[PDB]
Amino acid sequence: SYLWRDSEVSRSGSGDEPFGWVPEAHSVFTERILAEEPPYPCYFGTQGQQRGNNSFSAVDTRYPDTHGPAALARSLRAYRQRAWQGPKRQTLIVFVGPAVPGAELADDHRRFWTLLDELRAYDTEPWPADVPADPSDPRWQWCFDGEPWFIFAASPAYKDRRSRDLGPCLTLVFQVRRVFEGIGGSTVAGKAAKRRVREGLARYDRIGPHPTLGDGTDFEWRQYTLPDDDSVAAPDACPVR
220 neighbors 233 (Cβ within 8 angstroms): no
Query: Reading across the β-sheet that carries 91-97, which strands appear in turn?
Result: 54-60, 91-97, 170-176, 147-154, 143-144
Residue 150 within binding range of ligand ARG, rule CB under 6 A: yes
193 binds, among ligand HEM, ligand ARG, none (CB under 5 to 8 A by kind): ligand HEM
Residue 82 within binding range of ligand HEM, rule CB under 6 A: no
What is each CA distance from 101 to 84, 107, 189, in whole angstroms? Answer: 37, 12, 41
Residue 220 within binding range of ligand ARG, rule CB under 6 A: yes
Residue 152 within binding range of ligand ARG, rule CB under 6 A: yes
3-state secondary structure of 48: helix
Residues 6+ apart with CB under 8 A from 157: 103, 104, 105, 107, 108, 165, 228
Smallest distance from ligand ARG to CB 220, Å: 5
Which of 180, 207, 233, 235 touches ligand HEM by CB under 6 A? 180
Contact flags string 180-209 toward ligand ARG, x per CB under 6 A: x-----------------------------
Q: Is the CB of 41 or the CB of 68 nearer to ligand HEM? A: 41
Which of 44, 112, 174, 219 touches ligand HEM by CB under 6 A? 44
Q: How far is Cα 24 from Cα 65, in angstroms, rounded to an integer?
A: 23
Bond preceding residue 23 cis, omega within 30 of 0 = no
Residue 122 within binding range of ligand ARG, rule CB under 6 A: no
Q: Is the CB of 113 or the CB of 180 nearer to ligand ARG? A: 180
Which of 9, 21, 30, 45 touches ligand HEM by CB under 6 A? 45
What is each CA distance from 178 to 105, 114, 181, in whole angstroms? Answer: 29, 26, 5
164 neighbors 155 (Cβ within 8 angstroms): yes
Q: Which amino acid is at 152?
A: F
Chain contacts with ligand HEM (rule: CB under 6 A): 33, 41-42, 44-45, 48, 54, 89, 91, 93, 152, 163-164, 173, 179-180, 183, 193-194, 197-198, 213-214, 223, 226
